[PDB]
Amino acid sequence: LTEGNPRWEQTHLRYRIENYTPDLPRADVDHAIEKAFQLWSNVTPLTFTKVSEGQADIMISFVRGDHRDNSPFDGPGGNLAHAFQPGPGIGGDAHFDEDERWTNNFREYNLHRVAAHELGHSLGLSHSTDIGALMYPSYTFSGDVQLAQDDIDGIQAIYGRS
Numbered sequence: 001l002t003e004g005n006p007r008w009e010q011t012h013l014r015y016r017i018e019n020y021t022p023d024l025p026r027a028d029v030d031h032a033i034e035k036a037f038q039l040w041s042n043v044t045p046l047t048f049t050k051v052s053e054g055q056a057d058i059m060i061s062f063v064r065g066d067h068r069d070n071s072p073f074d075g076p077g078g079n080l081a082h083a084f085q086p087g088p089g090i091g092g093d094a095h096f097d098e099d100e101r102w103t104n105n106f107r108e109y110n111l112h113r114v115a116a117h118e119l120g121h122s123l124g125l126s127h128s129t130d131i132g133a134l135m136y137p138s139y140t141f142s143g144d145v146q147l148a149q150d151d152i153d154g155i156q157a158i159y160g161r162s
């Protein structure tokens with residue numbers, strides 16, 4: 001049996017930040033992430049819970065180069081991050097390119113921004129064409145980060161509304 005549009009069967013997800021980036025203070029990273037998950041669960045029946053150890057549906061880690069999977073990182077620039085669609089094991093997980101410089105401001109590569117998009121993948125969404133959507137594959141940022149009606153239509157189509 002092959003599923004083409006996998007989704008989480010539980011609207012009650014647990015995530016875990018496996019390791020941190022030296023680029024930013026632990027509380028900042030913790031904020032950018034919990035606040036990227038906030039975007040998604042507001043417009044759906046999704047419940048996210050942080051977990052420091054144990055089982056986590058979504059594992060988050062900052063890594064670099066070849067990190068075991070088959071989507072190695074290219075050093076500075078190029079890809080900045082990538083996530084896996086809903087599924088067992090590595091599915092739902094998000095890996096950020098440690099070679100990038102992660103900021104909490106307008107400088108190149110704001111973590112919250114990139115994180116909101118990768119989390120869209122862990123929840124089952126794919127890329128958008130609409131350049132004003134969070135799911136658009138190119139890095140953009142204007143101070144505030146919110147879901148576009150596009151991301152909202154895409155995500156509710158899978159789980160439901162709020």
Ligand SMILES: [Ca+2]
Binds near residue numbers: 088090091
């Ligand atoms: Ca997982």
Ligand SMILES: [Ca+2]
Binds near residue numbers: 073078079097099100
């Ligand atoms: Ca890179």
Ligand SMILES: [Ca+2]
Binds near residue numbers: 099101
């Ligand atoms: Ca770094």
Ligand SMILES: [Zn+2]
Binds near residue numbers: 069071072082
């Ligand atoms: Zn990876």
Ligand SMILES: [Zn+2]
Binds near residue numbers: 118121137
């Ligand atoms: Zn993407």
